[PDB]
Amino acid sequence: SPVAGQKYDYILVGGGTAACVLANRLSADGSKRVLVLEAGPDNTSRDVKIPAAITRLFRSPLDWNLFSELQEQLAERQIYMARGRLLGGSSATNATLYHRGAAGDYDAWGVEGWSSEDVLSWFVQAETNADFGPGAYHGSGGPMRVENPRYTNKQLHTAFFKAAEEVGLTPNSDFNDWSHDHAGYGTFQVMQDKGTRADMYRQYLKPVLGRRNLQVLTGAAVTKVNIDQAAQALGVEFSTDGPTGERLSAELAPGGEVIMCAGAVHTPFLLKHSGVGPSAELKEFGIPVVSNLAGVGQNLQDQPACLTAAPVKEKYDGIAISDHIYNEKGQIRKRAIASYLLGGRGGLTSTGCDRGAFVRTAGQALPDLQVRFVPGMALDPDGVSTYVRFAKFQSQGLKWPSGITMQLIACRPQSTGSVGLKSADPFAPPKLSPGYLTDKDGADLATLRKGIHWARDVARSSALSEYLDGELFPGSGVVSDDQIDEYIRRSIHSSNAITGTCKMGNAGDSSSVVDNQLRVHGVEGLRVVDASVVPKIPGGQTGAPVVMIAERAAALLTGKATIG
Numbered sequence: 001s002p003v004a005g006q007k008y009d010y011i012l013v014g015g016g017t018a019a020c021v022l023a024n025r026l027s028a029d030g031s032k033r034v035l036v037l038e039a040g041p042d043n044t045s046r047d048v049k050i051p052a053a054i055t056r057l058f059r060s061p062l063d064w065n066l067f068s069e070l071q072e073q074l075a076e077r078q079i080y081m082a083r084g085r086l087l088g089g090s091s092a093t094n095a096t097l098y099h100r101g102a103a104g105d106y107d108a109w110g111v112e113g114w115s116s117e118d119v120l121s122w123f124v125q126a127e128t129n130a131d132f133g134p135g136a137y138h139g140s141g142g143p144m145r146v147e148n149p150r151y152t153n154k155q156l157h158t159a160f161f162k163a164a165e166e167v168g169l170t171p172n173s174d175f176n177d178w179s180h181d182h183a184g185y186g187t188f189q190v191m192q193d194k195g196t197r198a199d200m201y202r203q204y205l206k207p208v209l210g211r212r213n214l215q216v217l218t219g220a221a222v223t224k225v226n227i228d229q230a231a232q233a234l235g236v237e238f239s240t241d242g243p244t245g246e247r248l249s250a251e252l253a254p255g256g257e258v259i260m261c262a263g264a265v266h267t268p269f270l271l272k273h274s275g276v277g278p279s280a281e282l283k284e285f286g287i288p289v290v291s292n293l294a295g296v297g298q299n300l301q302d303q304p305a306c307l308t309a310a311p312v313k314e315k316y317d318g319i320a321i322s323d324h325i326y327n328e329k330g331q332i333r334k335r336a337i338a339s340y341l342l343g344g345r346g347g348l349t350s351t352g353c354d355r356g357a358f359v360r361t362a363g364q365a366l367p368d369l370q371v372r373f374v375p376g377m378a379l380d381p382d383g384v385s386t387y388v389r390f391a392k393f394q395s396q397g398l399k400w401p402s403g404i405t406m407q408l409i410a411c412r413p414q415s416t417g418s419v420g421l422k423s424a425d426p427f428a429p430p431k432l433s434p435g436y437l438t439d440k441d442g443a444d445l446a447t448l449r450k451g452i453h454w455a456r457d458v459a460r461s462s463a464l465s466e467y468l469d470g471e472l473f474p475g476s477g478v479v480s481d482d483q484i485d486e487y488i489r490r491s492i493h494s495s496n497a498i499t500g501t502c503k504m505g506n507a508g509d510s511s512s513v514v515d516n517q518l519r520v521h522g523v524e525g526l527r528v529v530d531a532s533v534v535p536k537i538p539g540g541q542t543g544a545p546v547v548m549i550a551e552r553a554a555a556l557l558t559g560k561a562t563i564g
């Protein structure tokens with residue numbers, strides 16, 4: 001009805017990170033008619049704009065509120081897996097850390113035309129950096145805004161750095177400079193613009209919404225891609241009125257393409273609902289098989305986390321980031337609001353987890369462990385739960401105790417999971433299994449166990465033991481290797497990556513879902529341009545790599561670049 005009597009050159013399923021980039025580049029010359037379908041609303045919330053309000057976005061209406069299947073290897077728990085639901089997608093709800101990983105991550109993909117030397121200029125072309133000028137590893141002029149964080153905790157950030165040096169880590173002055181090793185300690189840059197969230201809606205989509213050839217629908221939930229076999233994508237079915245709503249169809253112009261941009265959870269889900277998937281699974285829900293692809297929904301990679309936390313001594317009460325945001329009765333400090341509005345500075349600019357380190361726990365080629373230091377104390381062993389608790393704590397009249405947290409992440413994990421269907425209803429949540437700690441060697445568990453040892457060694461250093469008064473998590477009860485393993489099974493949570501569910505592959509790779517041109521095997525006019533295509537997860541947060549893929553895909557589709 002908003003699409004009745006319209007042919008589109010491109011239909012984007014999802015209005016998230018990759019989609020905002022494609023919408024901008026594909027609508028640019030004005031010849032092409034581009035439709036964007038997003039299930040969630042427009043990007044207008046103040047909780048999106050203020051980085052510290054990430055605490056409020058978890059388990060909110062701007063999240064999909066996805067829970068995994070019971071994981072029997074994780075003390076029979078469901079895992080919450082946060083995902084953004086609005087224009088800008090997970091770029092709008094994320095912790096804003098800017099990581100490319102290492103050159104070696106892209107070389108390890110082994111896909112023709114996607115080596116480190118192929119992808120570097122696409123990272124650089126996207127970037128404007130406030131704190132690095134142009135050079136081999138940094139661009140000036142791209143739409144992304146990257147900066148050094150505008151909040152520093154003078155005592156605790158300094159102390160973490162001195163402690164890391166005491167246990168023998170070297171400083172890394174730029175985690176995105178591929179001329180030096182990934183390992184070491186320092187400051188993560190953030191996708192922020194003077195302390196405001198610089199998401200891909202703000203940077204890519206919002207500036208070009210005036211365009212006549214670009215149509216964006218919100219509250220538009222795609223139910224399947226329409227594919228005919230007389231196999232050719234025709235367009236897309238969606239509802240604007242939830243599950244009971246009338247199914248509408250958006251149709252392609254001749255030579256038009258459907259681009260899947262629904263992310264590493266919802267893209268394989270929708271492909272299965274469209275008959276692109278393993279025949280065994282599709283037959284169980286009476287879905288006609290159009291392209292029998294074993295790899296759709298397999299190879300799910302996510303970077304699991306656990307943490308330590310420790311209170312500061314009574315004489316250091318009031319020095320934590322929790323003290324910079326909340327007063328002793330849980331009111332937001334006037335000083336914090338004033339610094340944010342006057343100069344884009346202070347605690348409201350922080351997502352908390354923007355200092356840390358990459359570490360090799362056992363002489364691996366690339367670091368297996370990421371550390372995120374937070375100058376505030378977790379009150380739950382589940383860091384995402386604690387961020388929720390921090391949002392709900394406002395105006396409750398209590399004091400959040402001053403301390404620190406170290407989050408340990410298996411950043412190059414060996415375990416893989418899957419996403420499938422639990423029902424034939426396209427409005428049902430996916431069957432989601434993260435598969436943490438299932439790798440056959442127990443490498444991921446070993447990484448997190450050694451991470452806890454490492455965090456305890458850092459907290460025992462001169463530089464930090466000056467501040468600290470004991471340990472809250474994992475605590476006195478958790479000392480032996482077997483006690484640590486049990487704590488990890490019970491507390492493990494997502495560091496919120498999720499890639500690889502529609503893996504890109506070389507010719508002859510029967511486990512691949514898309515080729516090196518991002519075309520789905522056995523369907524004409526169907527591409528995937530989102531986190532699902534990443535073959536092997538890079539070390540670090542996965543937002544910047546998604547934008548790099550979307551930039552290169554835009555260049556390919558508009559004839560400006562080739563791959564191979």
Ligand SMILES: Cc1cc2nc3c(=O)[nH]c(=O)nc-3n(C[C@H](O)[C@H](O)[C@H](O)COP(=O)(O)OP(=O)(O)OC[C@H]3O[C@@H](n4cnc5c(N)ncnc54)[C@H](O)[C@@H]3O)c2cc1C
Pocket residue numbers: 013014015016017018019037038039040082083084085086087088089090091093094095096097098099220221222223261262263264266270495496497498529530531532541542543544546
């Ligand atoms: C809490 C959190 C913290 C993170 N922290 C960081 C970080 O610090 N730094 C970093 O670089 N990365 C981080 N990430 C990861 C990064 O945000 C993602 O990897 C990246 O944004 C994914 O981009 P995408 O385009 O693949 O998907 P998304 O940005 O998730 O976009 C997918 C879109 O499809 C929409 N959609 C789904 N189903 C349908 C349907 N049926 N119809 C229509 N639309 C639909 C969704 O609502 C969504 O908007 C974080 C992620 C989360 C959730």
Ligand SMILES: CCCCCCCCCCCCCCCCCC(=O)O
Pocket residue numbers: 046049050052053055056196325332337341348390391394
């Ligand atoms: C616990 C999490 C903190 C949440 C922060 C709430 C901030 C309330 C302060 C009053 C609103 C700030 C002014 C509105 C700024 C809108 C954002 C912007 O335009 O950059």
Ligand SMILES: CCCCCCCCCCCCCCCCCC(=O)O
Pocket residue numbers: 051052053055094095307321322350351352353374376377378379382383384386387390405407494495496
């Ligand atoms: C701006 C937020 C300040 C919050 C202070 C809360 C106290 C510290 C708890 C730290 C928990 C570990 C970090 C969890 C990171 C969650 C975000 C993410 O994964 O993207």
